[PDB]
Ligand binder design. Structure first.
Ligand SMILES: [K+]
Ligand SMILES: [K+]
Ligand SMILES: [K+]
Ligand SMILES: [K+]
Ligand SMILES: [K+]
Ligand SMILES: [K+]
Ligand SMILES: [K+]
Ligand SMILES: [K+]
Ligand SMILES: [K+]
Ligand SMILES: [K+]
Ligand SMILES: [K+]
Ligand SMILES: [K+]
Ligand SMILES: [K+]
Ligand SMILES: [K+]
Ligand SMILES: [K+]
Ligand SMILES: [K+]
Ligand SMILES: [K+]
Ligand SMILES: [K+]
Ligand SMILES: [K+]
Ligand SMILES: [K+]
Ligand SMILES: [K+]
Ligand SMILES: [K+]
Ligand SMILES: [K+]
Ligand SMILES: [K+]
Ligand SMILES: [K+]
Ligand SMILES: [K+]
Ligand SMILES: [K+]
Ligand SMILES: [Mg+2]
Ligand SMILES: [Mg+2]
Ligand SMILES: [Mg+2]
Ligand SMILES: [Mg+2]
Ligand SMILES: [Mg+2]
Ligand SMILES: [Mg+2]
Ligand SMILES: [Mg+2]
Ligand SMILES: [Mg+2]
Ligand SMILES: [Mg+2]
Ligand SMILES: [Mg+2]
Ligand SMILES: [Mg+2]
Ligand SMILES: [Mg+2]
Ligand SMILES: [Mg+2]
Ligand SMILES: [Mg+2]
Ligand SMILES: [Mg+2]
Ligand SMILES: [Mg+2]
Ligand SMILES: [Mg+2]
Ligand SMILES: [Mg+2]
Ligand SMILES: [Mg+2]
Ligand SMILES: [Mg+2]
Ligand SMILES: [Mg+2]
Ligand SMILES: [Mg+2]
Ligand SMILES: [Mg+2]
Ligand SMILES: [Mg+2]
Ligand SMILES: [Mg+2]
Ligand SMILES: [Mg+2]
Ligand SMILES: [Mg+2]
Ligand SMILES: [Mg+2]
Ligand SMILES: [Mg+2]
Ligand SMILES: [Mg+2]
Ligand SMILES: [Mg+2]
Ligand SMILES: [Mg+2]
Ligand SMILES: [Mg+2]
Ligand SMILES: [Mg+2]
Ligand SMILES: [Mg+2]
Ligand SMILES: [Mg+2]
Ligand SMILES: [Mg+2]
Ligand SMILES: [Mg+2]
Ligand SMILES: [Mg+2]
Ligand SMILES: [Mg+2]
Ligand SMILES: [Mg+2]
Ligand SMILES: [Mg+2]
Ligand SMILES: [Mg+2]
Ligand SMILES: [Mg+2]
Ligand SMILES: [Mg+2]
Ligand SMILES: [Mg+2]
Ligand SMILES: [Mg+2]
Ligand SMILES: [Mg+2]
Lengths: 122, 59
RNA sequence: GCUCAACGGAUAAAAGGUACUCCGGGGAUAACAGGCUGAUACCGCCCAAGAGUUCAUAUCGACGGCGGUGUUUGGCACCUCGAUGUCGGCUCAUCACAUCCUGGGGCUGAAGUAGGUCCCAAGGGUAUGGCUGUUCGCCAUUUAAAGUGGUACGCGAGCUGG
RNA sequence: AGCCAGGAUGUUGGCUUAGAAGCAGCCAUCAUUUAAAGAAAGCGUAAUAGCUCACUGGUCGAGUCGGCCUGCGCGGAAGAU
RNA sequence: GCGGGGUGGAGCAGCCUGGUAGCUCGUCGGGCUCAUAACCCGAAGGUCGUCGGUUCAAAUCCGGCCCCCGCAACCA
RNA sequence: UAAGGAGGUAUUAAAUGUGGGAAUUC
RNA sequence: CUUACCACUUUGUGAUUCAUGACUGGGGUGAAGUCGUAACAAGGUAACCGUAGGGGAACCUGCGGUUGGAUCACCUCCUUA
RNA sequence: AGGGCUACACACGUGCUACAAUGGCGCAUACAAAGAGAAGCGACCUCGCGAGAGCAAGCGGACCUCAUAAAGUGCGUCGUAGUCCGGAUUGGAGUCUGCAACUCGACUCCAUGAAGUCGGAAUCGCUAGUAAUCGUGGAUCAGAAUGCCACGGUGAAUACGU
RNA sequence: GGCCGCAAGGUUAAAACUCAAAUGAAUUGACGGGGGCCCGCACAAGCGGUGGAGCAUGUGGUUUAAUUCGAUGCAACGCGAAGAACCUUACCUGGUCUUGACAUCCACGGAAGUUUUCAGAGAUGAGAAUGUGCCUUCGGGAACCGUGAGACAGGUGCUGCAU
RNA sequence: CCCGCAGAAGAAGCACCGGCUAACUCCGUGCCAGCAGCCGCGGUAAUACGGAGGGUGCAAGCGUUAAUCGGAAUUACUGGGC
């Protein structure tokens, strides 16, 4: 399926609001990389964190071997910095997950073969 | 099958990480391949080709 | 002067229940069974795209076509409404063959064993239980096999009556 | 009709294929040796191979071929006292 | 068989009676706040299920088709 | 100046703040 | 030989204990989720205790009780020394 | 070396200029302070509508230059109009600095003549020579200020009170 | 589980599991929609503005080969920058160098220079004229240009959460 | 048990070093790998992880685990509280 188009889901994790901000940063990064590669992107959906960032986002990536190029990015991404939310500005850690799955064609409907059925009337 | 994928998905927690982006040390390291860079700004702007190509080459 | 529109307009003025029922009629008319039909149902055949590594026809067979049976669900309303009692079970059956087993054969993608498929063949044979009123069906365990049907979906002036 | 010879060459035409030699296809499908011999009609080989065959020669010596119209028949064609 | 519906992202109006799309939330921009919510000031967004007809003109009237609802489906 | 009694005062509104701190100490 | 006692063994009905059981009750825990904000300041309706009713939840309300509750300033008038 | 730092659907902060008549325009005419200057300030005179150019004094400065302050005052006009308000934008023609003004300078002349008619929620500064308004100079600097730093002119309102 | 109760419930009364604390009083602060007393253009009283327009300028965002880097509640945003056409410039594209643009040392050469020519966008490369001086035990040396090494140079690269 | 023979010849390891607790530095590592009796250590300048050098304590043993008592006056008779 490396040649297929793909979907990229970003979800915030342990950092809370910091993780949501980190997820938004990851979304921006991935969109920029897709633009560099010339793929076409469309936000399928995007849940936004209330204080900041996004809780989650699903993005559709279209192009030549988009799933091949993106599949290795599946995993959790750890971010370490000075929390721009903590009043004390302590050095915190936040986590965000990126999951890439290929676009799948809908299953062709199959008529129930009458030879496969036994009918009883009573 | 979808539920199996969800169960397989790594918990988004303190131990599970494929790439670490430490800005204070200005270092970014991919745990799987070992590829490390110092241009955090470029990577956050979208210079992921280094890590992606390294992962594909590693297979 | 009437949507007396149920429009040749019953009265100026009117809706329902009856399994508590009743009378006069109708096989002019329904429910069961018979009849006609055969859409449907079931069983065949014709063509051969294709499946079958190759190979349409070992086995299947798309898109389409032609029949058989009466055999499901029907159509009709010819018999019976001065009465033709019904589902299942029980007892006893009898015929068909479109054969389940046993018998004979052809082809096989039939090494043997064991099968597939078709042809001939109706002599005999062709379960016991769990559940359910059940037919059907599923399940357990057998058997060479646990056939498919007709007989008023056989059989209550034979029984039962869930 | 049988029957007897034959039934060649470039060349396995090349590609795609796993292999592809007439005979999976795709894909061209020519010229040469001439009596004639198909870049193959079929069988067949994993592929070849092999078996034919189309074609053509030679012996035997009168028909032979396959369409059209039409008459009558044959199969398709299984049911319950 | 007989009735209803299908309209900004959601829920409801507008149909009857042809000319005109409204309300509440939601979205977007600016405020307030250390920041978010709340709050305040502004904006945007539906060519009306889908086709067709009729009409000068159709969300509206008519007819299909699709989806959704209700009822009805009896004696037998 | 001190003591006692009485009357008036007054905000309607205002929810929330994740997860990585202390050398300074013979 | 017989009787008495009596071991094995047999039957019925209880008790207790261990394991287990579709489902179900609450409990503890958690480097992030949802809903509020119950308490700590008078925590913005003082809190808490017993009891009763109610409610997504912390809780709310009634009745009685406890202090293990904060504040108690200021202006005007009158009287007395 | 050339390009970018000057991009441009958009959002915010800080400014300048306005929306006019307590004003615009034309003519005339008063009153400052502070400061800079030698690869500098540059007078005068002549040429040019103008930005400027040519020639050329003086001054390392209480001496010379930058360098007429403007608001004001007097007269005239405009007569409430998107105007004789506003001056963005754009076309043409130039000047200067600088090797070099395309990207991307400042200024001048001509033509052009946008929004804007006093600004929603909200929000800022200031208690006296202050606010408001009017000019002037400086650094940085080859050239390039609505910014910054500084200097004078005119010159208020109000403060009951906590 | 037992006992009591009509019930609500009361009474008696565990264990597993989990934590390294829970707790009392007092102390210093900080905080309070607690109290008191004061003050500040904090209100109040006024005057003029901002938010609307055009333009300037900075920022964000977006764009871009690059749109260099920082500042980024009050206390960033006409801020570092008291002044980006080139230079600046730290960025990009392309062309170039490798002890080197900027130093010291060693060796070896050449005064310093000056003027040219050509080619290149320029860096630079190649060539041609012209001076060959100053101290100076004719040992020279060193102002200065190169060439060859290697100790080194060089970085507006990272960390203001080491300073 | 004694005498003779030969040559230093045949004979040293284990735990630990942040505090408690005797014993400290370098490198590796970078909330990972790991340590941990308690408090805890590790997130790029670790005496706490791992190696090394050095050191400390025991020694033909040294550590870990299991178990009892002590410390625990933490069931208090000795000898506690409300
Ligand atoms: K009538
Ligand atoms: K009736
Ligand atoms: K009844
Ligand atoms: K019958
Ligand atoms: K018939
Ligand atoms: K028929
Ligand atoms: K009858
Ligand atoms: K048989
Ligand atoms: K057979
Ligand atoms: K038979
Ligand atoms: K049934
Ligand atoms: K029968
Ligand atoms: K009878
Ligand atoms: K349970
Ligand atoms: K309360
Ligand atoms: K309280
Ligand atoms: K509820
Ligand atoms: K400005
Ligand atoms: K005008
Ligand atoms: K200047
Ligand atoms: K009761
Ligand atoms: K206080
Ligand atoms: K402004
Ligand atoms: K320029
Ligand atoms: K500092
Ligand atoms: K290191
Ligand atoms: K005692
Ligand atoms: Mg009539
Ligand atoms: Mg009854
Ligand atoms: Mg009755
Ligand atoms: Mg009757
Ligand atoms: Mg009749
Ligand atoms: Mg009938
Ligand atoms: Mg019938
Ligand atoms: Mg008739
Ligand atoms: Mg009859
Ligand atoms: Mg009769
Ligand atoms: Mg037969
Ligand atoms: Mg017979
Ligand atoms: Mg016989
Ligand atoms: Mg039964
Ligand atoms: Mg029948
Ligand atoms: Mg029967
Ligand atoms: Mg019968
Ligand atoms: Mg009978
Ligand atoms: Mg009965
Ligand atoms: Mg016939
Ligand atoms: Mg309309
Ligand atoms: Mg009935
Ligand atoms: Mg919340
Ligand atoms: Mg907190
Ligand atoms: Mg509260
Ligand atoms: Mg309270
Ligand atoms: Mg209540
Ligand atoms: Mg700039
Ligand atoms: Mg100057
Ligand atoms: Mg004007
Ligand atoms: Mg206008
Ligand atoms: Mg006007
Ligand atoms: Mg003051
Ligand atoms: Mg001024
Ligand atoms: Mg109890
Ligand atoms: Mg005020
Ligand atoms: Mg503005
Ligand atoms: Mg910047
Ligand atoms: Mg920096
Ligand atoms: Mg430049
Ligand atoms: Mg600091
Ligand atoms: Mg020690
Ligand atoms: Mg450290
Ligand atoms: Mg270290
Ligand atoms: Mg260690
Ligand atoms: Mg022990
Ligand atoms: Mg003791
Ligand atoms: Mg005690």
């Amino acid at each position: 399926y490396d040649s297929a188009d793909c979907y990229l889901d970003i979800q915030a994790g342990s950092g809370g609001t910091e993780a949501q901000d980190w997820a938004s940063m990851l979304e921006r990064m991935y969109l920029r990389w897709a633009e560099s590669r010339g793929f076409k992107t469309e936000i399928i959906k995007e849940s936004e964190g209330e204080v900041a960032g996004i809780k989650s986002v699903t993005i559709k990536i279209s192009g030549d071997y988009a799933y091949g190029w993106l599949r290795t990015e599946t995993g959790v991404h750890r971010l370490v910095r000075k929390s721009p939310f903590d009043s004390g500005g302590r050095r915190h850690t936040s986590f965000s997950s990126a999951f890439v799955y290929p676009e799948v064609d809908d299953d062709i409907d199959i008529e129930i073969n009458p030879a496969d059925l036994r009918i009883d009337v009573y | 099958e979808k539920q199996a994928m969800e169960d397989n998905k790594s918990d988004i927690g303190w131990g599970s990480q494929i790439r670490s982006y430490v800005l204070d040390d200005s270092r970014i390291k991919d745990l799987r391949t070992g590829v490390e860079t110092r241009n955090t700004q470029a990577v956050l702007d979208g210079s992921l080709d280094q890590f992606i190509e390294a992962s594909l080459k590693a297979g």
